């Protein structure tokens, strides 16, 4: 799978 990273915001 993969890890959740936050967008720009």
3-state SS track over 1-9: CCCCCCCCC
Q: What resolution in angstroms, rounded to 1 decimal?
A: 1.5
Residue listed under structure tokens 């890890």: 3
Solved with:
X-ray
Residues 1 and 3: their CA atoms lie apart, in Å, by 7
Burial (0-12, 13-18, 19+ Cβ within 10 Å), 5: exposed
Residues 9 and 3: their CA atoms lie apart, in Å, by 18
Give the number of other Cβ atoms within 10 Å of residue 7's Cβ.
4
């Amino acid at each position: 799978s993969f890890n959740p990273y936050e967008p720009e915001l």
